[PDB]
Design a protein around this ligand. Structure first.
Ligand SMILES: OC[C@H]1O[C@@H](O[C@H]2[C@H](O)[C@@H](O)[C@H](O[C@H]3[C@H](O)[C@@H](O)[C@H](O[C@H]4[C@H](O)[C@H](O)[C@H](O)O[C@@H]4CO)O[C@@H]3CO)O[C@@H]2CO)[C@H](O)[C@@H](O)[C@@H]1O
Ligand SMILES: [Ca+2]
Ligand SMILES: [Cl-]
Ligand SMILES: [Zn+2]
Length: 509
């Protein structure tokens, strides 16, 4: 019999959980709280005509993919920014409070939708329009598609004119400085053949931020949308890192420091959110937990359940090149937050792409629920899962926080102290609503693979809880279903045994 103690103190360690950590990039079968228009296809997206380029993902084709995939009505295909306005309209219609729109910085955007761009047509060429951050002339709501340029501030002006600025209820709240710059030369060689330099990235980031904030001073700028650890450390061995990086532990610090320096010179904050992508490198059973992982591989599933610990747990060392060679940078969230505190205090943190794999397996659901609990507890500002609607358990993990009862019930927005005696077999997160502990929310995860786990709860609260309603998902179904309520609570203590591999949301009142 596995027994674990859970101790919660509703008056301790209270901190707000950002509402935007429960987002997605794709259209999911889940209630989400943030939507990001980003990824490879957005680097070469031309807001003037909606064309974009697949890059290495598909023979460097310039076409109407984003219009098609975004479900844009054919009659709006030639309307400026229809890909983005359709994207934001959909988010608003689903009551999503945060929309993050990627702006273009690699240098050029698709001039047409004529198909493959040859290597001989590498920008500049008739296949491309050059991006300029500031128009330096009056904006138009009907951009000129005949000239050689596409302006980012004019694009933002079009959106602000239609939705109001970021401080308003319908405004687009954030903009990203492109996508995975250290991979521009790999993913988009026809646009940016040379490996990006640290100097180039900073210059573009500062220039684009200034351009955007002149139009919408309330919009938040996200950057650099780094693809993974190697970019966090050296911007993928950037050509000038040997000189630019002198004195810096990693590129993350250089980026924060230079953006703060530019902001100090300009007189306003130019970087609002440090933005990175985190696809776990954790392995189990001889394979990575994401990207082609086999759900039948039990060791991989078990590794998936523990992988979230790399985000926060100093005692956890995963099986990966990062766990082996980069221990000085783990756990990763504390290291990123420490860098922010040292080089640009006040900057927020966002994980704009991530996927723990096993999306259609209970372990993908439990790991997803664990990751969201960690994001909330450690202060992440915004997060957006990358993956499609076929990841039913990942979606259950999100709904466990955003809509656990099918009628809008959600996890509390204020994190409170909640400790477990065994962080390997379980995870537990607690929250209240605002400053009120009348209702105490608990996400309880049993990672035990083949046996139930008995949890002895001890709660310190100003309220005396009498019932705990429960909603959960497990191997029987990714549908979240209400379970028998917990009713024998004595002086805020109770015992609750959870079956193996089950994710629960308990609501005490
Ligand atoms: O129009 C031609 C052809 O398109 C086919 O659909 C393609 C589309 O053209 C292509 O652009 C799209 O690319 C995906 C890519 O497959 C995906 O891996 C990638 O994911 C990245 C992301 O960019 C992140 O920044 C980072 O690297 O992580 C994630 C991966 O976890 O995103 C790309 C889009 O941005 O793929 C589709 C499907 O193959 C049509 O199917 C076909 O009918 C058309 O003829
Ligand atoms: Ca133009
Ligand atoms: Cl990158
Ligand atoms: Zn689904």
């Amino acid at each position: 019999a596995k027994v674990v103690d859970i101790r919660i103190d509703t008056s301790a360690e209270r901190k707000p959980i950002s509402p935007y950590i429960y987002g997605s990039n794709q259209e999911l079968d889940a209630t989400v709280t943030a939507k990001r228009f980003g990824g490879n296809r957005t680097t070469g997206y031309n807001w003037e005509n909606n064309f974009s380029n697949a890059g290495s993902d598909w023979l460097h084709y310039s076409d109407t993919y984003l219009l098609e995939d975004g479900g844009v009505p054919k009659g709006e295909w030639s309307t400026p920014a229809s890909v983005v306005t359709t994207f934001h309209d959909k988010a608003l219609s689903k009551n999503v409070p945060y929309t993050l729109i990627t702006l273009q910085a690699a240098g050029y955007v698709s001039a047409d939708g004529n198909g493959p761009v040859s290597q001989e047509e590498t920008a500049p060429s008739s296949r491309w329009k050059e991006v300029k951050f500031e128009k330096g002339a009056p904006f138009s709501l009907t951009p000129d598609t005949e000239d050689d340029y596409v302006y980012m501030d004019e694009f933002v002006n079009y959106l602000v004119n239609k939705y109001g600025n970021a401080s308003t209820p319908t405004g687009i709240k954030g903009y990203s400085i492109d996508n995975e710059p250290a991979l521009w030369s790999h993913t988009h060689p026809r646009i940016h053949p040379d490996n990006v330099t640290a100097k180039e990235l900073i210059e573009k980031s500062v220039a684009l931020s200034k351009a955007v904030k002149k139009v919408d001073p309330y919009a938040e700028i996200f950057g650099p949308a780094l693809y993974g650890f190697a970019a966090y450390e050296t911007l993928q061995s950037a050509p000038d890192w040997g000189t630019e990086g002198e004195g810096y532990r990693w590129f993350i610090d250089y980026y924060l420091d230079k953006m703060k320096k530019a902001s100090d010179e300009e007189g306003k904050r130019l970087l609002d959110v440090l933005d990175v992508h985190w696809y776990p490198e954790a392995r189990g059973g001889g394979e990575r937990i994401c990207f082609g992982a086999d759900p039948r591989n039990i060791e991989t599933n078990k590794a998936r359940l523990q992988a979230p610990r790399t985000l926060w747990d100093p005692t956890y060392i995963e099986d990966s090149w990062i766990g082996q060679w980069k221990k000085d940078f783990l756990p990763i969230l504390p290291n990123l937050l420490d860098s922010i505190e040292k080089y640009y205090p006040g900057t927020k943190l966002a994980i704009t792409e991530y996927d723990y794999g096993g999306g259609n397996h209970i372990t993908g659901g439990i790991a997803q629920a664990d990751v969201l609990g960690i994001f909330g507890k450690y202060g992440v500002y915004l997060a957006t899962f990358w993956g499609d609607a076929s990841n039913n358990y990942t979606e259950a993990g999100i709904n466990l926080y955003t809509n656990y009862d099918g009628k809008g019930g959600k996890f509390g927005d204020t994190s409170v102290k909640c400790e477990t005696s065994d962080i390997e077999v379980s995870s537990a997160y607690a929250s209240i609503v605002g400053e009120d502990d009348s209702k105490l929310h608990i996400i309880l995860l049993n990672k035990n693979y083949d046996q139930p786990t008995t949890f002895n709860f001890s709660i310190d609260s100003s309220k005396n809880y009498t019932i705990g309603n429960v909603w959960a998902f497990d191997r029987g179904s990714s549908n979240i279903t209400q379970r028998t309520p917990i009713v024998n609570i004595k002086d805020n203590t109770f015992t609750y045994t959870v079956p193996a591999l089950t994710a629960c949301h308990i609501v005490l009142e």
